[PDB]
Design an enzyme around this catalytic site. Structure first.
Site, mmCIF file in Angstrom:
data_model
loop_
_atom_site.group_PDB
_atom_site.id
_atom_site.type_symbol
_atom_site.label_atom_id
_atom_site.label_comp_id
_atom_site.label_asym_id
_atom_site.label_seq_id
_atom_site.Cartn_x
_atom_site.Cartn_y
_atom_site.Cartn_z
ATOM 1 N N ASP A 27 0.740 -1.263 0.000
ATOM 2 C CA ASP A 27 0.000 0.000 0.000
ATOM 3 C C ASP A 27 0.777 1.326 0.000
ATOM 4 O OD1 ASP A 27 -1.217 -0.385 3.460
ATOM 5 O OD2 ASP A 27 0.757 0.093 2.615
ATOM 6 N N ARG A 81 0.613 6.784 0.141
ATOM 7 C CA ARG A 81 -0.267 5.717 0.570
ATOM 8 C C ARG A 81 -1.368 5.641 -0.493
ATOM 9 N NH1 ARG A 81 -3.320 1.905 1.398
ATOM 10 N NH2 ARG A 81 -4.149 1.341 3.464
ATOM 11 N N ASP A 99 -6.676 -1.669 0.789
ATOM 12 C CA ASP A 99 -6.121 -2.325 1.981
ATOM 13 C C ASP A 99 -5.458 -3.629 1.546
ATOM 14 O OD1 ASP A 99 -6.824 -0.521 3.931
ATOM 15 O OD2 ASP A 99 -8.711 -1.534 4.396
ATOM 16 N N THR A 100 -4.134 -3.667 1.585
ATOM 17 C CA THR A 100 -3.385 -4.857 1.200
ATOM 18 C C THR A 100 -2.968 -5.647 2.434
ATOM 19 O OG1 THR A 100 -1.495 -3.371 1.132
ATOM 20 C CG2 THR A 100 -2.389 -4.129 -0.991
ATOM 21 N N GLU A 102 -0.675 -7.026 5.219
ATOM 22 C CA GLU A 102 0.545 -6.490 5.807
ATOM 23 C C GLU A 102 1.581 -7.590 5.937
ATOM 24 O OE1 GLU A 102 0.986 -2.266 7.257
ATOM 25 O OE2 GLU A 102 -0.300 -3.463 5.936
ATOM 26 N N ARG A 161 1.944 10.961 4.785
ATOM 27 C CA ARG A 161 2.001 10.294 3.499
ATOM 28 C C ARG A 161 0.983 10.916 2.545
ATOM 29 N NH1 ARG A 161 1.145 4.270 5.742
ATOM 30 N NH2 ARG A 161 -0.883 5.262 6.112
#
Length: 130
Positions: A15, A29, A34-35, A37, A76
């Site tokens: 992300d 970002r 939502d990837t 982690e 970010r």
């Protein structure tokens, strides 16, 4: 919205990415995604490998800020990022390597587009949807 040029400084993970934007290093970002982690969730390294190849292999990188807030609390930049005209945010969702995240402070321009890519990946039971 409008695409602005950028130069990849360093891939980071699914992300986020480090880009030289307007002469200054900045980490971004990816909006609405939502990837998994890895800092190591399931399909976490897959997602990182995916965006890593996408950024490094591209001839052109562009950052596209949405209409809401442009930076999160951690400094970010919040944007849709393109590699040779292909939106990395969408590509991840479409490959089933990320889910669509809730809208954040008005940045929802591509929410439907991503929602569709996601429905398609789910239908194909692709990766995360295995």
């Amino acid at each position: 919205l409008h695409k602005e040029p950028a130069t990849l400084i360093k891939a980071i993970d699914g992300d986020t990415v480090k880009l030289m934007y307007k002469g200054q290093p900045m980490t971004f970002r990816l909006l609405l995604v939502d990837t998994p982690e890895t800092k190591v969730e399931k399909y976490g390294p897959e997602a990182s490998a995916f965006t890593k190849k996408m950024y490094e292999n591209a001839k052109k990188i562009e950052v596209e800020f949405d209409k809401g807030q442009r930076t999160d609390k951690y400094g970010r930049g919040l944007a849709y990022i393109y590699a040779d005209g292909k939106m990395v945010n969408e590509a991840l969702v479409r490959q089933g390597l990320a889910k669509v995240a809730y809208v954040y402070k008005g940045n929802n321009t591509h929410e439907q587009l991503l929602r569709k890519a996601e429905a398609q990946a789910k239908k194909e039971k692709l990766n995360i949807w295995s």
